[PDB]
Amino acid sequence: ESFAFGAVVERRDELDGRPWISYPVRVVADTPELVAVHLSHGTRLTFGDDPFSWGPHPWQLFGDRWQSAGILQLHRPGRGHSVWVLRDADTGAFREWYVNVEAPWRRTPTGFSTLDHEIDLVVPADSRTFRWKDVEKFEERARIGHFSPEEATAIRAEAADVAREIAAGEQWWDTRWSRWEPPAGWNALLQSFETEGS
Ligand SMILES: [Ca+2]
Ligand SMILES: [Ca+2]
């Protein structure tokens, strides 16, 4: 099973057995080596009903549309992260690679499902160095039970693996993706994934 290039699919974070946040993305690649999807500026965000074990998804500060520059997400099937191509909202300049540690993506009839795992890594565009992010925030959340011990050990190992890869110059992703730009017609997507009535 695969999705076609340009298909509009759901990108979901699933928490407590239900959608936490979901938003439509366009498919750029759906291959055994790469799932690449695009979240465009102005796209509608769907949030699940409270309460969640983790509280409301933090993108709820933007209300119900993605206000910033579009995000290309690059995923190597089976890995416990994806890599986001982040650009400057004002200039469109490529700024950084944002490694979002999260559950390996699951294919669903509607798209892909994952779940944020708090630890992030950031590689600036110049590729001089990289930084770990939110490790202690992660650990506090693991201590209060947001992650089980088995989950938290998997998360720590995944983040360590990616950091070791980057530091060895063996980052899996093709950095030429930093020059990709969406087709001109790839604008805001307005699809809601809400299931009213519950
Ligand atoms: Ca994250
Ligand atoms: Ca984080």
Report the C-alpha gap between 36 and 31 in whole angstroms. Answer: 9
Closest by CA to 178, choosing from 103, 77, 69, 26, is 69
Report the C-alpha gap between 176 and 104 in whole angstroms. Answer: 23
Query: What is the 3-class SS of the chain, one letter each residue?
Result: CCCCCCCEEEEEEEECCEEEEEEEEEEEEECCCCEEEEECCCCECEECCCCCCCCCCHHHHHCCECCCCCEEEEECCCCCEEEEEEECCCCCCEEEEEEEEECCCEECCCEEEECEEEEEEEEECCCCCCEEECHHHHHHHHHCCCCCHHHHHHHHHHHHHHHHHHHCCCCCCCHHHHHCCCCCCCCCCCCCCCCCCC
Residue pair 118/141 in contact by the 8 Å Cβ criterion = yes
To one decimal, the resolution in angstroms is 1.4
Residue 134 Cα to ligand 1 middle (Å): 8
- The annotated binding site for a divalent metal cation is made up of 100, 116, 118, 120, 134
Residue 100 Cα to ligand 2 middle (Å): 8
Residue 157 buriedness (CB in 10 A; 0-12 / 13-18 / 19+): exposed
Taking CB atoms within 8 Å and a gap of at least 24, the contacts of 132-141 are 132/159, 132/163, 135/159
Q: Tell me the two tokens of residue 29.
A: 């690649």
- Which residue type does 152 have? A
List the catalytic residues: 133
Report the C-alpha gap between 72 and 28 in whole angstroms. Answer: 9
Ligand nearest to the CA of 98: 1
By the CB criterion, residues less than 5 angstroms from ion ligand 1 are: 100, 116, 120
Report the C-alpha gap between 164 and 63 in whole angstroms. Answer: 37
Place of tokens 């200039």: 91
Report the C-alpha gap between 63 and 43 in whole angstroms. Answer: 11
Q: Tell me the two tokens of residue 48.
A: 């699940």
Residue 32 buriedness (CB in 10 A; 0-12 / 13-18 / 19+): exposed
Residues in the chain: 198
Question: What is the b/e burial string over 88-126, where b = at least 16 CB atoms within 10 angstroms of the residue's CB?
Answer: eeeeeebbbbbbbbbbbbeeeeebbbbbbbbbbbbbebe
- The annotated binding site is made up of 59, 65, 67-68, 100, 116, 118, 120, 133-134
Residue pair 62/43 in contact by the 8 Å Cβ criterion = no
Residue 141 Cα to ligand 2 middle (Å): 11
Report the C-alpha gap between 154 and 160 in whole angstroms. Answer: 10
Neighbours of 144 (CB within 10 A): 8
Residue 185 Cα to ligand 1 middle (Å): 28
Closest by CA to 182, choosing from 85, 107, 99, 95, is 85
Neighbours of 127 (CB within 10 A): 14
Ligand nearest to the CA of 131: 2
Between CA 77 and CA 76, with CA 183 as vertex, the angle to 5 degrees is 10
Residue 101 Cα to ligand 2 middle (Å): 8
Q: How far is CA 175 from CA 33, 74, 128, 178, in A?
A: 15, 11, 14, 6
Q: How was this structure obtained? A: X-ray
